[PDB]
Amino acid sequence: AAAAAANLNAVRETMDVLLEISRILNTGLDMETLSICVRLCEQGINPEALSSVIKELRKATEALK
Amino acid sequence: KSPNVLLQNLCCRILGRSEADVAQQFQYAVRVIGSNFAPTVERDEFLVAEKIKKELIRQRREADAALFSELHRKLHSQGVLKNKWSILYLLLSLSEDPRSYATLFAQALPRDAHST
Amino acid sequence: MIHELLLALSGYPGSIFTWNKRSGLQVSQDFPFLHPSETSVLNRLCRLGTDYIRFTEFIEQYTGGLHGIYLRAFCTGLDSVLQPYRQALLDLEQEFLGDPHLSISHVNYFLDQFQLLFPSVMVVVEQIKSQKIHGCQILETVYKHSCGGLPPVRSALEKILAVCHGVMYKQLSAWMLHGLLLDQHEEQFSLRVEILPSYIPVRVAEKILFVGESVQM
Amino acid sequence: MIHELLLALSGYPGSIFTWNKRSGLQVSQDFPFLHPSETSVLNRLCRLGTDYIRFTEFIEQYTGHVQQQQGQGGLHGIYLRAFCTGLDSVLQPYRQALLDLEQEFLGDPHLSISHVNYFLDQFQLLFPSVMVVVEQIKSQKIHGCQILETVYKHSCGGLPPVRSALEKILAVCHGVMYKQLSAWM
Amino acid sequence: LWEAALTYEASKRRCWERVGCPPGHREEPYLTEAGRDAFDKFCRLHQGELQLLAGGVLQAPQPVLVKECELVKDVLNVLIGVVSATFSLPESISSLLSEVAEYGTCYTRLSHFSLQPKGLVFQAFTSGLRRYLQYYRACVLSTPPTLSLLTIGFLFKKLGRQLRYLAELCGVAFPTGVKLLSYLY
Amino acid sequence: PDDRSWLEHHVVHQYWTARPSQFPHSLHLHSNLAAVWDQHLYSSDPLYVPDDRVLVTETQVIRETLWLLSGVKKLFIFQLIDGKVTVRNNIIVTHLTHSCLRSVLEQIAAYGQVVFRLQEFIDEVMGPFRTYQAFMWALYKYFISFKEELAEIEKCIINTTITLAIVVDKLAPRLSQLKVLHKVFSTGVAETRNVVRASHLLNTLYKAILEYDEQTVSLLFSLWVETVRPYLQTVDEWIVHGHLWDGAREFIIQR
């Protein structure tokens, strides 16, 4: 398809916009992680439920470092 | 897709544990994500951006707030996402300073004075 | 539209904007899709492009009363000052390729620093024409106005002043080492007193001549 | 259009380039898909192949058609064969350039003809200069040692490629007279 | 899958008239900038146009196909002395073939002319020619690793003419005895 | 269509041949300028008379201009009509609506005349003085270095975004050096005697190097040496051989 390619182009644009938004909101994610989060709230899930998970998981990897 | 299998990918992205190695944190993750899957606060992709703009004026980086208005406009220009409130609310929740009070600045609707 | 505008501000006249020798780039087309106030906006914008057009013509001839290698050095400094105005014209096209929603103001905004630079050097350019300066007093008439009052017009004229010093670093190397003058147009011979800038003293200027003459013997 | 120019220019011309002895090479030139843009580049390139064919034809015509034997020096003689001998060795870098282009076309054939004209531009000047030098020898029926002078006035030249190219061939023609001198003296 | 595909390398082949974010649509090369496939197709078209304008009494036997390397092996077999499937003892290809082919058809016309090991000095003289036939047989199968087609034409030009010189010495009766012994002197 | 379709794919086939343009780009005024200018005209009631032009796209123009500038003549625009090239007046692009197009292309035409003239002068060498022959040689040596950069820009058109102001700006430092040759050749065609025609040419370059006594000066230097090359040879011959030989004296002192 052709419009599916330009749609995919626009999804790269949106994930780069979200990458700018993440880097000046200065989160611990990289690109590939926030992609997985975008999958999570594309299907519909709580950001307040994901945030507590990411907030202890980033603290449970400095606990045995 | 399935939301349950996607949860372990986050646990292997954050911690370096392998997928058959991390089953404790994903067990806890089923506890927090499960039965907290439906929204408890009203959806607002507009208000979350208007509260980041409030923060950006409060830090007196007013040129970056007008940069964020452009980023919000590009977000609206593409329009591929289904829920744009959730990822921005998620980025706001996990915030840290790049480098006071918010009890007098407004929160959002409780869905009890709104619809349950 | 946004290439037609971006050449009309350049040396090209435009077919929406009407060039005229009294003053050009005059909006004279009425459109239903542009708000009626837009023309007024346009007029202030046009105040930029005029100067650039006139500037290019003055640069086109050079680079008696008005001649000399100094006029091929002043005009080169005038090239140098328009150089980031050139680059910041290509960048706008690059932006407009991606974004279709950008307003006219962003142009007006981004090149508002040359709406102070361009008119205030035009008076220097006319002053160099009305008074038939081609000599060494060109450093003088830069040097009084290089003090400036606004920071962009303070750096632009520094760029122009450096080259005119650089020529007198060639004349005084033929002179004080080989004993040679008249490798260029003027301004036993000696220095003409009337063409000296005041911030170079008369005593040092005497010493220069004595050094140059003693070499020849 | 890429390979075919090599096949024409190599001296084994096709039917696109119908060789005449009064126009040289000429493209077929009757298409609603041929433009003036290709035309001028083609016409510039046609001269070089016509010159190469005339050169090789001259060399073949005067070398390898008798053992060593008219007594007319414009049609026969050792000095002329020595001239042809020098000419082919001068013709070698043209062939090297053609093969060099061919390898890159096998690598990627989407390269433009303008680059070919750009490469072949250096021989575009050299070939017409040496053309008149061989043409005079054939035209005036010049006998013997006078042939040595005819190149020689043209080998005090003012262009490095032309002068250097004729000079080696004049050395060949020197050598044959030296060999006869090694007998008579 | 959709975000595994997301990681595309964004468009730069983007026209000025197109603001709707094109992924590209291929700049559309020059007329000559297709000449490895469009050339062959145009060759086919040009021949068929000639066939229509003649009536169809020409009827090409496919002088294109085969491509390059197989023919290099075929002409290498002609250098052994065994002829091609085209000869007995694009369409531009015929010219390139004929020039190198006539050398091999003369190589065979030398080898059958040297079948003797009457005339003693003529026999020794004949073995002297076989010693060159072995040289021509020795240069092939060492120098080529299957090079390009044009290298064969250029490289065997400086050498094939030298072979063709030697056919003029031979008949292809002939002086023998004291007559040959003085003629060769 | 077996030939037409294969052509349509990889080659352009719509403006150097009689065919209307079929390429829906992106419409909407910033590149729809031709049609919106037409509609604005008709709403202002000219009164009418439609103009027939082909409406060629943009990048083609860049291709044509490059091929013209590199040295070859005879293209589909800028056909000479009197010995001065003239753009085809039935050519319009989807933006700049045939009036500004003619302005930028007339500025390009002004540079193209010099190259066309010098190319023609070299063409007449292919068709004893030998100083003119020594002149065209240095001109030629400049021209190969010129054509290199022109071809380099053509290589990147096969790959990128293509508009006028980029490639013009890339060719700014070559159109600058080009202006000097219009004045040195003007005194090289300002001439009667074979010695005055060489000396009047030669003295211009010495005066122009003493003017700046950069990049123009390296040009003038490389042209200076390649034009004083005959004189070094003739004076060297006269010194070492003790006689002045010259076919048709180009030498200032008569024996």
Explain the overall architecture.
The structure is cut from a larger assembly and holds one copy of chain A (65 residues), one copy of chain B (116 residues), two copies of chain C, one copy of chain E (185 residues) and one copy of chain F (255 residues). By secondary structure, chain A is mainly α. Chain A has three helices and no strands. Chain B contains five helices and no strands. Chain B is globular. Chain C is built from eight helices and two strands, in the order αββααααααα. Chain C is elongated, with a radius of gyration of 22 Å. In chain E, α3 (69-80) runs parallel beside α4 and α4 crosses α7. Chains in contact: A-B, A-E, C-E, C-F, D-E, D-F, E-F. The interface between A and B is large, with 44 and 46 residues. Chain F: It is found in: Cytoplasm, Cytoskeleton, Microtubule organizing center, Centrosome. Chain F: This is Gamma-tubulin complex component 5. Chain F: It comes from Homo sapiens (Human).
Brief description of this entry?
This is part of a larger assembly, with one copy of chain A (65 residues), one copy of chain B (116 residues), two copies of chain C, one copy of chain E (185 residues) and one copy of chain F (255 residues). Chain C is an all-alpha fold and 217 residues long.
Query: Helices and strands of chain B: which structural class?
Result: mainly alpha
Largest sheet of chain C: 2 strands, antiparallel
Largest sheet of chain B: none
Q: Report how far the terminal alpha carbons of chain B are from each other.
A: 27 Å
| Computed CA radius of gyration of chain B, to the nearest angstrom | 18 Å
State the helical fraction of chain C. Answer: 55-70%
Strand content of chain B: under 5%
Give the number of DSSP strands of chain B. 0
Largest interface: A-B, 44 and 46 residues
Structural class per helix/strand content of chain C?
mainly alpha
As an assembly, this protein is part of a larger assembly
Q: Write down the overall geometry of chain C.
A: elongated
Helix content of chain B: 40-55%
Beta content of chain C: under 5%
Order of helices and strands of chain C: HEEHHHHHHH
Strand order of the largest sheet of chain C: 1-2
Rg calculated over all Cα atoms of chain C:
22 Å
Please describe the structure with a list of short key phrases separated by commas or semicolons:
part of a larger assembly; 6 chains; C: 217 residues; mainly alpha; two-stranded antiparallel ribbon; 8 helices; elongated; E: 185 residues; 53% helix; Mitotic-spindle organizing protein 1 (chain A); cytoskeleton (chain A); cytoplasm (chain A)
Topology record:
The structure is cut from a larger assembly and holds one copy of chain A (65 residues), one copy of chain B (116 residues), two copies of chain C, one copy of chain E (185 residues) and one copy of chain F (255 residues).
Chain A lengths: L2 H22 L6 H12 L4 H11 L8
Chain C lengths: L4 H4 L8 E2 L7 E2 L10 H25 L8 H28 L5 H7 L3 H17 L6 H7 L7 H28 L23 H15 L1
Antiparallel strand pairs in C: 1-2
Chain F lengths: L3 H7 L22 H11 L15 H12 L8 E2 L4 E2 L13 H27 L5 H24 L8 H7 L1 H16 L8 H16 L4 H26 L14
Antiparallel strand pairs in F: 1-2
Helix pairs in contact in F: 3-5, 4-5, 5-9, 8-9
